[PDB]
From a paper:
During the early steps of HIV infection, IN catalyzes the initial covalent attachment of the viral cDNA to host cell nuclear DNA. The catalytic core domain (residues 50–212) adopts an RNase H superfamily fold and contains a D,D-35-E motif that binds Mg2+ or Mn2+ ions, which mediate DNA cleaving and joining. An additional class of IN inhibitors, the allosteric inhibitors of integrase (ALLINIs), act at a second site on HIV IN.
Structures of the GSK1264, BI-D, and tetraphenylarsonium (TPA) complexes were reported previously; the structure of GSK002 bound to the catalytic core domain at 1.75 Å is newly reported here. To investigate the mechanism of GSK002 resistance further, we determined three high-resolution crystal structures, one of GSK002 bound to catalytic core domain-only, one of GSK002 bound to the catalytic core domain containing the Ala124 substitution, and one of GSK002 bound to the catalytic core domain with Thr125. However, rotation of the Trp235 side chain could create enough space for the inhibitor, so we suggest that GSK002 could be accommodated in a nearly identical interface. Thus, this analysis supports the concept that CTD–ALLINI–catalytic core domain interactions are relevant to aggregation in vitro and that the shape and positioning of the ALLINI molecule is critical for the aggregation reaction. We speculate that the IN polymer formed in the presence of GSK002 is similar to that seen for GSK1264, with side chains remodeled to accommodate the interaction, but how these small structural differences influence inhibitor potency and escape mechanisms is just beginning to be studied.
Residue numbers in the entry:
A (entry chain A), B (entry chain A): 57 to 188, 193 to 208
Write the structure that this text describes.
Amino acid sequence: SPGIWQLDCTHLEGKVILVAVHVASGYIEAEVIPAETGQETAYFLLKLAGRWPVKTIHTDNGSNFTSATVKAACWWAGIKQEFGIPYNPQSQGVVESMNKELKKIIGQVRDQAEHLKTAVQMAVFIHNKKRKGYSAGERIVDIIATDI
Amino acid sequence: SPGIWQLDCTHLEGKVILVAVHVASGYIEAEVIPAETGQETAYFLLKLAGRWPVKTIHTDNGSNFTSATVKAACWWAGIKQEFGIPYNPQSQGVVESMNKELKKIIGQVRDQAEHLKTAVQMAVFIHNKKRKGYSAGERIVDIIATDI
Ligand SMILES: Cc1nc2c(ccn2Cc2ccc(F)c(F)c2)c(-c2ccc3c(c2C)CCCO3)c1[C@H](OC(C)(C)C)C(=O)O
Ligand SMILES: Cc1nc2c(ccn2Cc2ccc(F)c(F)c2)c(-c2ccc3c(c2C)CCCO3)c1[C@H](OC(C)(C)C)C(=O)O
């Protein structure tokens, strides 16, 4: 489904990186957030939902979607709650692979910037433009355009 | 051209809103930034360029693209410098109209949130999904997919 995104946080240098993966394409949106809080996740979801047609959110940590602020963002944006991760052999290992690739790229470009957030955005850019043939960026735009 | 974006800052409640308009579609990306600085504009451009294929940036304030940090972001992302705004009757008034519409929507939803940044993201969501027929969100994905 083109409306499914998986959101997870990863920790690096005492900072938190919120990583959203568009499951059907492997496209990533990421932000360095001041703390792993419900208010940060809610704000991130409102931004994401205004940029792409988000129908469902998945995660490897269900408790991060329990706060009143996150429930309010999903209610307002019309995003449906997902219990666990439904078995889908087509997307098996895709989210883990995209997160592994992003982490590797961050490590590879880290010394090119002072701030971790700068290295993270360089890594998102490299990841989204990398041809695998099409790139994740080309794939998401094709998937969504064809779904419209 | 599908690679042209116009970036400008607007001021509201003592805060700064950086508004990026995809000129061919009217699609918007916006963020509330802590101050009108070169480092904030540079970071915003790196994020934008990793999400969409940005070729050229326009603005109504040329001096905001003179810092070493902004020049570095454009160099790394391969974004070309534009002197003034070239005459294009097809896009006449589009950026001004999109900014006017965003400002009106912010005013309309402002009392639904505590934080201005929340109202801004609600406004971006409403703007991008509004059918004018297609929405700006549907138009950008069609323009970029067809350009690929
Ligand atoms: C924090 C920061 N400063 C930057 C720069 C560029 C110039 N300067 C000024 C400067 C002057 C003298 C130095 F000795 C020095 F080390 C840096 C980028 C920057 C901006 C864009 C960019 C890159 C860099 C390094 C790398 C490739 C992708 O695009 C930075 C940068 O921080 C912001 C993006 C927030 C401005 C950083 O983290 O280093
Ligand atoms: C700051 C903030 N808090 C929120 C909420 C929701 C619950 N709460 C807790 C709360 C509890 C008791 C209250 F009396 C009270 F006023 C708010 C949103 C929020 C989150 C998402 C959202 C909306 C709201 C209001 C409006 C529609 C779009 O989606 C907020 C919100 O701030 C963050 C998004 C940063 C969490 C805000 O600015 O109000």
